[PDB]
Amino acid sequence: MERASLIQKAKLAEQAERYEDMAAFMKGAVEKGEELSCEERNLLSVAYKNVVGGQRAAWRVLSSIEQKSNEAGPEVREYREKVETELQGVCDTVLGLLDSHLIKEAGDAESRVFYLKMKGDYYRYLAEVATGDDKKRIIDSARSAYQEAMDISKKEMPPTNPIRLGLALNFSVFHYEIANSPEEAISLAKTTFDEAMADLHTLSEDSYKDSTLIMQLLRDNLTLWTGS
Amino acid sequence: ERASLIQKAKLAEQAERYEDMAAFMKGAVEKGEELSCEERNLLSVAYKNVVGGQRAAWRVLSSIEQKSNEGPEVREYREKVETELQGVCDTVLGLLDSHLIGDAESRVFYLKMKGDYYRYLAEVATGDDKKRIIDSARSAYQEAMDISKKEMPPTNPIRLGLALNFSVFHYEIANSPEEAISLAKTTFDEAMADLHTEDSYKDSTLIMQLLRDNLTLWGSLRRASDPAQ
């Protein structure tokens, strides 16, 4: 069998910063149809986060140029469309993996939340580029994925859990940027922060590291969305 | 069309999409037309980044492969990366040889680029082949050095860049650390001499700084006397 080899190669690709290869290896490993361990889920996420991150960054540059020139010819639109299409291909691939293999009405709650957060994240990336037609559905598919994830995490995981914090952080970004609900973004972020803060002495070192890093991102967004 | 491919290559540079940038520049070249100064740099920037990423990865994987057996996945994947890297170098050398040609200034530039890409093949070549590739890199650089020395000022950034890379070739590839250091100091001392002199100062000085860096890396600067502390 080559599942273990695909996973070993994905770890090598991570060290070599070959994220497209990392994503492909993890995709193939998922497709062997066995659940992923904690380590393996993170490899899947790291890989696609980086792949899509690069496409999004590029799309932003190109879209920004396209808009500021509309008072550099058809080339900007054509190339922005190429990048956009490619990006959608990645999100569709990731959502295809989540729906066909990973998300299940079964198993522990953390991994359930992890995949639904991932589902919200990738529908949110589709929403970043979508036009009014697709937009509404997509925004809503992102909202339900996050909301379902939020409901589980709130009942099953501590407020200091990094998957829970990460979920809240991203859902608040969704509110601010995508849904155009800056109030619930600010509110969710403050609430998340304060609830986690109250529970910090229950966390000992090592877990405190992971969680305070995400709490620092919440504080940063809050300061940005308001004042220092 | 050609002008569109060049416009798209500029956009790809801004979006940091170097594989796309390389492909657009390849297509623009393929259309014969000599490249302007700006266009040559776009070609170089694109492939420098593409191959840079493959080299960095190859470095990591080869390093793991060597430290480890002192596991077939490492070899297989290192081979995949290596093969892909060779494909890029072969593509670039194919462009240089196929659509090479005009003037002395630009002739240096392409021969330097020819030396650079044969040097990247040498970074991974095994034996019978490695030894030949090293010479194709050496002649490309040497021919370019001879032109630059007779036609360009010692402050010229293409000339400085060529010297810098040829000296790297000597230390790393040819295992001639003596001429690598000789060449690198000679190059920086000859440029330092005529520094005061349009105004491309900052352009040139950046490459001078790389020569001192790589020389300090190979004691540090000049002799040491008692440091007051």
Short mmCIF file of C-alpha atoms in Angstrom, two decimals:
data_model
loop_
_atom_site.label_atom_id
_atom_site.label_comp_id
_atom_site.label_asym_id
_atom_site.label_seq_id
_atom_site.Cartn_x
_atom_site.Cartn_y
_atom_site.Cartn_z
CA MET A 1 0.00 0.00 0.00
CA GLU A 2 1.07 3.69 -0.62
CA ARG A 3 -1.14 5.74 1.80
CA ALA A 4 1.72 5.91 4.34
CA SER A 5 4.14 6.87 1.48
CA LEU A 6 1.84 9.62 0.25
CA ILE A 7 1.73 11.00 3.80
CA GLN A 8 5.55 10.76 4.09
CA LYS A 9 5.92 12.60 0.79
CA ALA A 10 3.48 15.28 1.95
CA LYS A 11 5.70 15.87 5.02
CA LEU A 12 8.75 16.18 2.71
CA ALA A 13 6.88 18.59 0.42
CA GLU A 14 6.05 20.74 3.50
CA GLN A 15 9.75 20.91 4.37
CA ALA A 16 10.65 21.75 0.79
CA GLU A 17 7.80 24.35 0.64
CA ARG A 18 6.30 22.52 -2.36
CA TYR A 19 2.66 23.13 -1.39
CA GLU A 20 1.02 22.14 -4.68
CA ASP A 21 2.79 18.75 -4.37
CA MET A 22 1.83 18.59 -0.65
CA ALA A 23 -1.81 19.18 -1.51
CA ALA A 24 -1.74 16.53 -4.24
CA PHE A 25 -0.19 13.93 -1.90
CA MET A 26 -2.74 14.67 0.86
CA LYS A 27 -5.58 14.54 -1.66
CA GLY A 28 -4.43 11.11 -2.74
CA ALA A 29 -4.07 9.96 0.88
CA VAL A 30 -7.60 11.15 1.73
CA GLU A 31 -8.79 9.26 -1.32
CA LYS A 32 -7.55 5.99 0.19
CA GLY A 33 -10.69 6.30 2.27
CA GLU A 34 -9.68 6.17 5.82
CA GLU A 35 -10.11 8.85 8.33
CA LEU A 36 -7.25 11.29 8.96
CA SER A 37 -5.41 11.53 12.25
CA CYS A 38 -4.83 14.97 13.89
CA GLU A 39 -1.40 15.31 12.24
CA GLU A 40 -2.79 14.30 8.84
CA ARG A 41 -5.71 16.79 9.01
CA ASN A 42 -3.24 19.59 9.68
CA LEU A 43 -1.11 18.45 6.71
CA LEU A 44 -4.20 18.60 4.51
CA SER A 45 -5.08 22.05 5.83
CA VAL A 46 -1.54 23.50 5.67
CA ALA A 47 -1.16 22.33 2.08
CA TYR A 48 -4.37 23.77 0.71
CA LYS A 49 -4.16 26.91 2.89
CA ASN A 50 -0.84 27.74 1.18
CA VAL A 51 -1.97 26.79 -2.32
CA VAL A 52 -5.11 28.85 -2.15
CA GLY A 53 -3.35 31.61 -0.23
CA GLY A 54 -1.07 32.24 -3.19
CA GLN A 55 -3.94 32.30 -5.63
CA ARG A 56 -5.93 34.67 -3.45
CA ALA A 57 -3.01 37.03 -3.02
CA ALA A 58 -2.54 37.11 -6.78
CA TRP A 59 -6.24 37.52 -7.44
CA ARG A 60 -6.27 40.51 -5.04
CA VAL A 61 -3.39 42.18 -6.86
CA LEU A 62 -4.95 41.64 -10.27
CA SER A 63 -8.48 42.54 -9.23
CA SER A 64 -7.10 45.70 -7.58
CA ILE A 65 -5.31 46.66 -10.83
CA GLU A 66 -8.42 45.84 -12.88
CA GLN A 67 -10.54 48.17 -10.70
CA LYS A 68 -8.14 51.13 -10.40
CA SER A 69 -7.59 51.23 -14.23
CA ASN A 70 -11.37 51.21 -15.00
CA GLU A 71 -11.77 55.04 -14.72
CA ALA A 72 -4.38 48.06 -18.75
CA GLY A 73 -6.56 46.66 -21.58
CA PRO A 74 -8.24 43.21 -21.83
CA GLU A 75 -5.10 41.43 -20.56
CA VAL A 76 -5.86 42.23 -16.89
CA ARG A 77 -9.38 40.81 -17.06
CA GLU A 78 -8.28 37.68 -19.00
CA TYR A 79 -5.49 36.93 -16.52
CA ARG A 80 -7.59 37.77 -13.47
CA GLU A 81 -10.21 35.32 -14.86
CA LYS A 82 -7.50 32.63 -15.36
CA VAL A 83 -6.37 33.03 -11.72
CA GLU A 84 -9.97 33.16 -10.49
CA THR A 85 -10.92 29.97 -12.37
CA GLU A 86 -7.85 28.15 -11.05
CA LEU A 87 -8.68 29.27 -7.49
CA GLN A 88 -12.24 28.03 -7.83
CA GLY A 89 -10.84 24.70 -9.04
CA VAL A 90 -8.86 24.37 -5.79
CA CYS A 91 -11.81 25.33 -3.57
CA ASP A 92 -14.06 22.91 -5.47
CA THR A 93 -11.45 20.19 -5.01
CA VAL A 94 -11.22 20.84 -1.26
CA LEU A 95 -15.00 21.01 -0.80
CA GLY A 96 -15.26 17.81 -2.86
CA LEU A 97 -12.92 16.09 -0.41
CA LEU A 98 -14.78 17.41 2.59
CA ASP A 99 -18.19 16.35 1.25
CA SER A 100 -17.26 13.00 -0.30
CA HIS A 101 -14.79 11.73 2.33
CA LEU A 102 -14.13 13.75 5.42
CA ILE A 103 -17.26 15.33 6.86
CA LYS A 104 -19.31 12.72 8.64
CA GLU A 105 -22.37 12.66 11.02
CA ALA A 106 -20.12 10.52 13.24
CA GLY A 107 -16.86 10.74 15.18
CA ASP A 108 -15.35 13.13 17.70
CA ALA A 109 -16.52 16.69 17.79
CA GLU A 110 -13.19 18.42 17.26
CA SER A 111 -12.56 16.79 13.88
CA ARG A 112 -16.21 17.39 12.99
CA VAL A 113 -15.78 21.12 13.79
CA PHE A 114 -12.34 21.17 12.01
CA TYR A 115 -13.85 19.97 8.71
CA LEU A 116 -16.93 22.25 8.93
CA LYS A 117 -14.64 25.20 9.68
CA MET A 118 -12.63 24.14 6.59
CA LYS A 119 -15.89 23.94 4.64
CA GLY A 120 -16.80 27.51 5.72
CA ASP A 121 -13.28 28.75 4.89
CA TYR A 122 -13.33 27.39 1.35
CA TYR A 123 -16.90 28.58 0.58
CA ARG A 124 -15.72 31.95 2.00
CA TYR A 125 -12.80 31.94 -0.48
CA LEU A 126 -15.27 31.28 -3.31
CA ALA A 127 -17.35 34.20 -1.98
CA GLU A 128 -14.29 36.48 -2.08
CA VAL A 129 -14.43 36.35 -5.92
CA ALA A 130 -18.06 35.46 -6.72
CA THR A 131 -20.52 37.77 -8.59
CA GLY A 132 -24.05 38.52 -7.28
CA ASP A 133 -25.59 35.39 -8.93
CA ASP A 134 -23.47 32.62 -7.25
CA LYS A 135 -22.68 34.98 -4.32
CA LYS A 136 -25.79 34.52 -2.29
CA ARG A 137 -25.82 30.70 -2.27
CA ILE A 138 -22.11 30.56 -1.62
CA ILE A 139 -22.30 33.06 1.25
CA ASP A 140 -25.08 31.00 2.75
CA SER A 141 -23.25 27.65 2.35
CA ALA A 142 -20.31 29.31 4.20
CA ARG A 143 -22.58 30.66 6.90
CA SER A 144 -24.29 27.29 7.68
CA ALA A 145 -20.95 25.42 7.72
CA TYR A 146 -19.56 27.91 10.24
CA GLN A 147 -22.75 28.10 12.25
CA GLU A 148 -23.05 24.33 12.57
CA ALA A 149 -19.36 24.27 13.58
CA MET A 150 -19.92 27.03 16.12
CA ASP A 151 -22.85 25.24 17.69
CA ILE A 152 -20.82 22.04 18.20
CA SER A 153 -17.72 23.77 19.47
CA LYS A 154 -19.69 25.85 21.98
CA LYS A 155 -21.34 22.72 23.50
CA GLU A 156 -18.40 20.29 23.25
CA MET A 157 -15.05 22.17 23.40
CA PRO A 158 -13.49 24.55 25.87
CA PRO A 159 -13.42 28.24 24.90
CA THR A 160 -9.59 28.09 24.83
CA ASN A 161 -9.48 25.26 22.31
CA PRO A 162 -7.47 26.47 19.31
CA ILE A 163 -9.81 24.85 16.72
CA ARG A 164 -12.74 26.66 18.42
CA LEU A 165 -10.80 29.96 18.57
CA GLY A 166 -9.70 29.63 14.96
CA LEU A 167 -13.30 28.92 13.92
CA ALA A 168 -14.59 31.98 15.76
CA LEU A 169 -11.82 34.15 14.30
CA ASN A 170 -12.65 33.07 10.74
CA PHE A 171 -16.41 33.30 11.21
CA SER A 172 -15.94 36.85 12.50
CA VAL A 173 -13.80 37.65 9.43
CA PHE A 174 -16.70 36.19 7.41
CA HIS A 175 -19.10 38.56 9.12
CA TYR A 176 -16.90 41.61 8.63
CA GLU A 177 -15.65 41.04 5.05
CA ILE A 178 -18.21 38.81 3.35
CA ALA A 179 -21.60 39.18 4.98
CA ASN A 180 -21.02 42.88 5.67
CA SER A 181 -22.07 42.53 9.37
CA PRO A 182 -19.20 44.38 11.07
CA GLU A 183 -21.19 44.55 14.34
CA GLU A 184 -21.45 40.74 14.84
CA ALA A 185 -17.82 40.41 13.69
CA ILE A 186 -16.67 42.80 16.37
CA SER A 187 -19.08 41.28 18.92
CA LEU A 188 -18.17 37.65 18.16
CA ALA A 189 -14.45 38.48 18.28
CA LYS A 190 -14.71 40.27 21.68
CA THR A 191 -16.92 37.53 23.13
CA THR A 192 -14.56 34.81 21.90
CA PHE A 193 -11.55 36.63 23.29
CA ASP A 194 -13.11 37.36 26.69
CA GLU A 195 -14.42 33.77 27.18
CA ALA A 196 -11.05 32.28 26.30
CA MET A 197 -9.31 34.87 28.50
CA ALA A 198 -11.38 33.82 31.52
CA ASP A 199 -10.19 30.24 31.05
CA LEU A 200 -6.46 30.88 30.56
CA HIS A 201 -5.17 29.72 33.94
CA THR A 202 -6.89 26.36 33.33
CA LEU A 203 -4.52 26.06 30.30
CA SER A 204 -0.93 25.19 31.19
CA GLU A 205 2.10 26.03 28.97
CA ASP A 206 2.19 24.38 25.44
CA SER A 207 -1.67 24.77 25.01
CA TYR A 208 -1.42 28.36 26.30
CA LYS A 209 1.02 29.00 23.35
CA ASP A 210 -1.36 27.76 20.61
CA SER A 211 -4.39 29.50 22.05
CA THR A 212 -2.78 32.84 22.88
CA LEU A 213 -1.47 33.07 19.41
CA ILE A 214 -5.09 32.96 18.06
CA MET A 215 -6.32 35.26 20.81
CA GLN A 216 -3.64 37.75 19.67
CA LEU A 217 -5.12 37.58 16.14
CA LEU A 218 -8.60 38.34 17.59
CA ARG A 219 -7.19 41.35 19.51
CA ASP A 220 -5.42 42.53 16.29
CA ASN A 221 -8.65 42.35 14.28
CA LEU A 222 -10.60 44.06 17.00
CA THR A 223 -8.07 46.94 17.15
CA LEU A 224 -8.16 47.19 13.34
CA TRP A 225 -11.95 47.14 13.06
CA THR A 226 -12.18 49.93 15.78
CA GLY A 227 -9.13 51.74 17.47
CA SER A 228 -5.88 51.15 19.55
CA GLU B 1 -0.19 38.73 -29.42
CA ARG B 2 3.39 39.52 -28.30
CA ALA B 3 2.64 42.85 -26.58
CA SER B 4 -0.21 41.15 -24.60
CA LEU B 5 2.06 38.30 -23.50
CA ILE B 6 4.56 40.89 -22.26
CA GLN B 7 1.78 42.83 -20.45
CA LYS B 8 0.58 39.60 -18.82
CA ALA B 9 4.16 38.77 -17.76
CA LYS B 10 4.34 42.17 -15.97
CA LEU B 11 1.04 41.38 -14.21
CA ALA B 12 2.26 37.90 -13.23
CA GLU B 13 5.39 39.56 -11.71
CA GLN B 14 3.16 41.82 -9.59
CA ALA B 15 1.00 38.87 -8.56
CA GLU B 16 4.16 36.77 -7.83
CA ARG B 17 2.95 34.11 -10.30
CA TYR B 18 6.42 33.23 -11.62
CA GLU B 19 5.51 30.00 -13.46
CA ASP B 20 2.91 32.03 -15.41
CA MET B 21 5.45 34.86 -15.90
CA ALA B 22 7.98 32.42 -17.33
CA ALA B 23 5.38 30.89 -19.66
CA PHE B 24 4.31 34.33 -20.97
CA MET B 25 7.94 35.39 -21.56
CA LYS B 26 8.71 32.06 -23.24
CA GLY B 27 5.81 32.65 -25.61
CA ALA B 28 6.91 36.24 -26.26
CA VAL B 29 10.49 35.13 -27.05
CA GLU B 30 9.34 32.19 -29.22
CA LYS B 31 7.93 34.91 -31.56
CA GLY B 32 11.55 35.67 -32.68
CA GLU B 33 11.70 39.42 -32.07
CA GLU B 34 14.76 40.40 -30.07
CA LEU B 35 14.01 41.44 -26.48
CA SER B 36 14.45 44.96 -25.18
CA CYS B 37 16.32 45.60 -21.87
CA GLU B 38 13.07 45.52 -19.88
CA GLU B 39 11.92 42.32 -21.60
CA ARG B 40 15.25 40.50 -20.99
CA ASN B 41 14.95 41.28 -17.29
CA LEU B 42 11.36 39.97 -17.26
CA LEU B 43 12.59 36.74 -18.84
CA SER B 44 15.40 36.48 -16.29
CA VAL B 45 13.31 37.40 -13.23
CA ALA B 46 10.69 34.83 -14.17
CA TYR B 47 12.98 31.87 -14.66
CA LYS B 48 15.28 32.90 -11.77
CA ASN B 49 12.29 32.59 -9.41
CA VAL B 50 10.94 29.40 -10.95
CA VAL B 51 14.23 27.61 -10.81
CA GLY B 52 15.08 29.18 -7.47
CA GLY B 53 12.14 27.41 -5.88
CA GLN B 54 13.05 24.10 -7.41
CA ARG B 55 16.67 24.43 -6.32
CA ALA B 56 15.73 25.32 -2.78
CA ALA B 57 13.48 22.28 -2.63
CA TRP B 58 16.06 20.03 -4.23
CA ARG B 59 18.56 21.31 -1.64
CA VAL B 60 16.24 20.34 1.24
CA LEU B 61 15.40 16.94 -0.16
CA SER B 62 18.96 16.06 -1.19
CA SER B 63 20.14 17.12 2.29
CA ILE B 64 17.55 14.81 3.90
CA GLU B 65 18.46 11.98 1.51
CA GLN B 66 22.16 12.27 2.46
CA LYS B 67 21.82 12.66 6.25
CA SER B 68 19.15 9.94 6.44
CA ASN B 69 21.06 6.97 5.00
CA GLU B 70 24.14 7.24 7.30
CA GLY B 71 13.45 4.99 2.76
CA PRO B 72 12.53 5.20 -0.96
CA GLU B 73 10.12 8.14 -0.79
CA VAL B 74 12.93 10.72 -0.38
CA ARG B 75 14.83 9.49 -3.42
CA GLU B 76 11.67 9.23 -5.59
CA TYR B 77 10.56 12.76 -4.70
CA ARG B 78 14.05 14.22 -4.94
CA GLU B 79 14.24 12.65 -8.45
CA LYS B 80 10.81 14.18 -9.36
CA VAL B 81 12.02 17.64 -8.30
CA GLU B 82 15.40 17.14 -10.00
CA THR B 83 13.77 16.06 -13.29
CA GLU B 84 11.40 19.04 -13.21
CA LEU B 85 14.34 21.41 -12.51
CA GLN B 86 16.29 19.99 -15.43
CA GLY B 87 13.22 20.52 -17.61
CA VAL B 88 13.27 24.23 -16.74
CA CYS B 89 17.00 24.61 -17.35
CA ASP B 90 16.68 22.76 -20.66
CA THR B 91 13.79 25.04 -21.62
CA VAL B 92 15.82 28.17 -20.79
CA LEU B 93 18.95 26.94 -22.57
CA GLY B 94 16.71 25.99 -25.52
CA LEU B 95 15.47 29.57 -25.69
CA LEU B 96 18.97 30.97 -25.41
CA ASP B 97 20.37 28.66 -28.14
CA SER B 98 17.22 28.65 -30.38
CA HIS B 99 16.37 32.45 -30.12
CA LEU B 100 19.69 33.83 -28.80
CA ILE B 101 20.31 36.61 -31.31
CA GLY B 102 22.18 41.02 -30.75
CA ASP B 103 24.68 43.70 -29.49
CA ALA B 104 27.69 43.17 -27.11
CA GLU B 105 25.79 44.42 -23.96
CA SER B 106 22.90 41.99 -24.49
CA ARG B 107 25.36 39.20 -25.66
CA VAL B 108 27.00 39.24 -22.26
CA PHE B 109 23.57 39.04 -20.56
CA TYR B 110 22.48 35.91 -22.49
CA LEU B 111 25.87 34.18 -22.09
CA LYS B 112 25.78 34.92 -18.35
CA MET B 113 22.29 33.41 -18.33
CA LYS B 114 23.63 30.41 -20.30
CA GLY B 115 26.38 29.94 -17.66
CA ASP B 116 23.85 30.31 -14.82
CA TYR B 117 21.52 27.62 -16.17
CA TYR B 118 24.31 25.14 -17.03
CA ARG B 119 25.58 25.87 -13.47
CA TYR B 120 22.13 24.92 -12.09
CA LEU B 121 22.28 21.66 -14.05
CA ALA B 122 25.77 21.10 -12.58
CA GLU B 123 24.37 21.58 -9.06
CA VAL B 124 22.57 18.14 -9.54
CA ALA B 125 24.59 16.27 -12.22
CA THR B 126 26.08 12.84 -11.36
CA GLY B 127 29.33 12.03 -13.22
CA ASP B 128 30.11 11.58 -16.98
CA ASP B 129 27.44 14.28 -17.62
CA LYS B 130 28.40 16.59 -14.62
CA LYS B 131 31.96 17.01 -15.92
CA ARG B 132 30.76 18.13 -19.44
CA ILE B 133 27.98 20.51 -18.13
CA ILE B 134 30.63 22.21 -15.95
CA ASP B 135 32.59 23.08 -19.10
CA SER B 136 29.58 24.34 -21.02
CA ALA B 137 29.00 26.66 -17.99
CA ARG B 138 32.64 27.68 -17.88
CA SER B 139 32.92 28.62 -21.61
CA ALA B 140 29.64 30.57 -21.50
CA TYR B 141 30.91 32.60 -18.53
CA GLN B 142 34.40 32.98 -19.91
CA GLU B 143 33.20 34.24 -23.29
CA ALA B 144 30.84 36.67 -21.52
CA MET B 145 33.75 37.81 -19.19
CA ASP B 146 35.98 38.50 -22.16
CA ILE B 147 33.33 40.72 -23.82
CA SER B 148 32.38 42.59 -20.66
CA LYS B 149 36.03 43.33 -19.80
CA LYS B 150 36.65 44.88 -23.28
CA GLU B 151 33.26 46.58 -23.81
CA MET B 152 31.67 47.49 -20.43
CA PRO B 153 32.87 49.64 -17.50
CA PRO B 154 33.84 47.71 -14.33
CA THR B 155 30.92 49.44 -12.54
CA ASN B 156 28.41 47.90 -15.07
CA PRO B 157 25.80 45.85 -13.16
CA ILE B 158 25.57 43.13 -15.87
CA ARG B 159 29.41 42.86 -15.70
CA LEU B 160 29.39 42.81 -11.88
CA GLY B 161 26.60 40.25 -11.78
CA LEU B 162 28.48 38.07 -14.28
CA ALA B 163 31.68 38.23 -12.22
CA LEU B 164 29.76 37.48 -9.01
CA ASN B 165 28.14 34.38 -10.54
CA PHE B 166 31.31 33.17 -12.25
CA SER B 167 33.11 33.43 -8.90
CA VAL B 168 30.29 31.43 -7.27
CA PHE B 169 30.84 28.91 -10.10
CA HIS B 170 34.51 28.71 -9.22
CA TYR B 171 33.95 28.16 -5.44
CA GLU B 172 30.89 25.89 -5.52
CA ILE B 173 31.05 24.02 -8.81
CA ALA B 174 34.56 23.92 -10.18
CA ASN B 175 36.09 23.67 -6.68
CA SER B 176 38.59 26.52 -7.41
CA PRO B 177 38.16 28.62 -4.25
CA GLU B 178 41.38 30.53 -5.06
CA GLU B 179 40.12 32.03 -8.37
CA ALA B 180 36.61 32.53 -6.82
CA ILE B 181 38.11 34.84 -4.15
CA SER B 182 40.68 36.33 -6.58
CA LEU B 183 37.95 37.15 -9.08
CA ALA B 184 35.51 38.51 -6.49
CA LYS B 185 38.03 40.86 -4.84
CA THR B 186 39.46 41.97 -8.24
CA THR B 187 35.92 42.70 -9.43
CA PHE B 188 35.02 44.78 -6.32
CA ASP B 189 38.34 46.66 -6.24
CA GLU B 190 38.05 47.62 -9.96
CA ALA B 191 34.41 48.85 -9.43
CA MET B 192 35.31 50.64 -6.12
CA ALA B 193 37.99 52.56 -7.97
CA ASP B 194 35.59 54.33 -10.38
CA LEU B 195 32.61 54.68 -7.97
CA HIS B 196 31.90 58.50 -8.13
CA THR B 197 30.57 57.89 -11.73
CA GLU B 198 23.33 59.90 -15.44
CA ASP B 199 23.42 58.20 -11.91
CA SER B 200 23.17 54.38 -11.61
CA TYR B 201 25.18 54.38 -8.25
CA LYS B 202 22.72 52.37 -6.10
CA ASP B 203 22.17 49.84 -8.99
CA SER B 204 25.85 48.84 -9.11
CA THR B 205 26.60 49.12 -5.32
CA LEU B 206 24.04 46.49 -4.46
CA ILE B 207 26.05 43.85 -6.45
CA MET B 208 29.30 45.16 -4.89
CA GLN B 209 27.72 44.43 -1.49
CA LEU B 210 27.01 40.83 -2.58
CA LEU B 211 30.69 40.42 -3.59
CA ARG B 212 31.92 41.64 -0.15
CA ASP B 213 29.31 39.39 1.57
CA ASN B 214 30.34 36.23 -0.26
CA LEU B 215 34.03 37.16 0.31
CA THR B 216 33.57 37.77 4.11
CA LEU B 217 31.78 34.38 4.17
CA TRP B 218 34.85 32.82 2.40
CA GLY B 219 37.99 35.37 8.06
CA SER B 220 36.15 38.78 7.55
CA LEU B 221 36.98 41.79 5.08
CA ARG B 222 40.73 42.70 5.82
CA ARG B 223 43.00 41.99 8.84
CA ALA B 224 41.99 42.59 12.51
CA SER B 225 43.62 44.82 15.08
CA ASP B 226 42.70 45.06 18.88
CA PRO B 227 39.01 46.01 19.23
CA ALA B 228 38.33 48.62 21.91
CA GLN B 229 35.15 47.52 23.85
#
